[PDB]
Amino acid sequence: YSLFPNSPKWTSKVVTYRIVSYTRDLPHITVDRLVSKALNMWGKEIPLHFRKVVWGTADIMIGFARGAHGDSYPFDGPGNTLAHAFAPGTGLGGDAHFDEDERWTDGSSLGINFLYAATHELGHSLGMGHSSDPNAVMYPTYGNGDPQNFKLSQDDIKGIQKLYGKRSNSRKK
Ligand SMILES: COc1ccc(S(=O)(=O)N2CCc3cc(O)c(OC)cc3[C@@H]2C(=O)NO)cc1
Ligand SMILES: [Ca+2]
Ligand SMILES: [Ca+2]
Ligand SMILES: [Zn+2]
Ligand SMILES: [Zn+2]
Numbered sequence: 716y717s718l719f720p721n722s723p724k725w726t727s728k729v730v731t732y733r734i735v736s737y738t739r740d741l742p743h744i745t746v747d748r749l750v751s752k753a754l755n756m757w758g759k760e761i762p763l764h765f766r767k768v769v770w771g772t773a774d775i776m777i778g779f780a781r782g783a784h785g786d787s788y789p790f791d792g793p794g795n796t797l798a799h800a801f802a803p804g805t806g807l808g809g810d811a812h813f814d815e816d817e818r819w820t821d822g823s824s825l826g827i828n829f830l831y832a833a834t835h836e837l838g839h840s841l842g843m844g845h846s847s848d849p850n851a852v853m854y855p856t857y858g859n860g861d862p863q864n865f866k867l868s869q870d871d872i873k874g875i876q877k878l879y880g881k882r883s884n885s886r887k888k
Pocket of ligand 2: 776805807808809
C-alpha cells in the first residue's frame with residue numbers, strides 16, 4: 716505494501732475529526748460511538764489519538780450523501796461503491812464520504828456494517844491501507860470478508876505494521 720503519492724500517516728500524534736453530515740439508519744450517538752470504537756480499534760495497534768474540533772474543518776471530515784454530492788466523485792446510491800475516502804496530506808486529504816442511500820447497520824444480521832465501513836474508510840484517512848487478501852478488512856467489493864466481526868483481521872495489522880514498522884513479505888496480485 717500500500718504505497719501511494721500521499722503522506723502515509725499525519726505528522727501529529729493527535730488528529731481531528733468533523734462529522735459534517737450523518738447517516739439515518741442508525742443515530743448520531745451510534746455514529747460517534749461506532750467511530751470511537753472503530754478508531755479505538757485502530758488506536759489499539761498505534762499510539763495515535765483523535766479529538767473533535769470546536770469551529771473549523773477537521774483533518775478527518777466524515778460526510779454522508781444520498782446519490783451524488785458536491786465532491787470530487789459523485790456517488791450512485793444503492794449498489795456499486797458504498798463509501799470513498801482520500802489519503803491524508805492536509806486539506807481534502809484524509810476526508811471520507813459515505814452513501815446514506817446504502818442501508819447502514821451497526822451489526823445485527825443484514826445490511827451494510829457501519830463499524831466495518833467506518834474502519835475501512837477511516838483506515839485510508841489514517842494513512843492508506845488497501846490489500847487483495849481473501850478476508851482483507853479493506854478488501855475491494857464485499858464477499859468472504861465477514862463484516863460482522865473483523866477487529867482488524869490481517870490486512871489491517873499488515874498495513875499498520877508496514878507503516879508503523881518496516882518488515883513485510885513480498886507478494887504481487
Ligand atoms: C461496508 O464497507 C465498505 C464496502 C465496500 C466499499 S466500496 O465503496 O465498494 N470500496 C471498495 C471498492 C472501491 C473502488 C474504487 O474505485 C474506489 O475509488 C476510490 C473506492 C472503493 C471503495 C473503497 O475502497 N473505499 O475506500 C466501501 C466500504
Ligand atoms: Ca481532510
Ligand atoms: Ca452506492
Ligand atoms: Zn465524495
Ligand atoms: Zn478502500
